[PDB]
Design a protein around this ligand. Structure first.
Ligand SMILES: CC[C@H](NC(=O)C[C@H](O)[C@H](CC(C)C)NC(=O)[C@@H](NC(=O)[C@H](Cc1cccc2ccccc12)NC(C)=O)C(C)C)C(=O)N[C@@H](Cc1cccc2ccccc12)C(N)=O
Lengths: 104, 104
């Protein structure tokens, strides 16, 4: 599917068997699940301490956690960061894995 | 051109006749020039007070300024926000104008 950017590009993905609406963000180097979302997952793996991320408002502490993402018939097994951010974002690391491309 | 997201999707655009490397960010609702970049523009228009933007680290104050952007043979005349952020970002407002699309 093609997102023309009239609205924020969001889609539902299954993370640890829980359908979540996520933002597809080419400006995010890495993917981050909101703490609220991490707490609603049907299954959770261990929490590994992380070393933060930065954005427009400064830096925020993170932890990392193992997840399985299902979308586009792919089963991706990776680590995602967790942080108190406003929305769950799929960044370049997972976007590359799913085959997403930005065309200008 | 197609960005496969192995690296941050950046490109050079001319803003007020000044070539700048900008980040193409589908996660940004609106475009923001860094203060450093605004100060290096060959030409600058008036500054209009704005009402901030938010991101991962909280909110940051902004002002808006009229600009002309040239890229892909288009001449776009619009307003961009200015703020002390780490990089200049072209968000959905300008991305839509240039015809960019994200494909998943
Ligand atoms: C972890 C992600 C980080 N990237 C980023 O923060 C860049 C990424 O596009 C982010 C997603 C947004 C969703 C947090 N975008 C923004 O912050 C943009 N905000 C908006 O559009 C808001 C959206 C927004 C705000 C509030 C609530 C929202 C609820 C739902 C949806 C959107 C929401 N609208 C407004 C009107 O306030 C700004 C750029 C215009 C990142 O890649 N960090 C890097 C490198 C880095 C370090 C320091 C500062 C950076 C600043 C920008 C990009 C990268 C930066 C890293 N390695 O840590």
């Amino acid at each position: 599917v093609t997102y023309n950017l009239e609205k924020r590009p969001t889609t539902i993905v299954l993370i640890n068997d829980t359908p979540l609406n996520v933002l597809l963000d080419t400006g995010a180097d890495t993917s981050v699940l909101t703490t609220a979302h991490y707490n609603r997952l049907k299954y959770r793996g261990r929490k590994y301490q992380g070393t933060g991320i930065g954005g427009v408002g400064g830096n925020v502490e993170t932890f990392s956690t193992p997840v399985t993402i299902k979308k586009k018939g792919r089963h991706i097994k990776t680590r995602m960061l967790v942080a108190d951010i406003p929305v769950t974002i799929l960044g370049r690391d997972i976007l590359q894995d799913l085959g997403a491309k930005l065309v200008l």
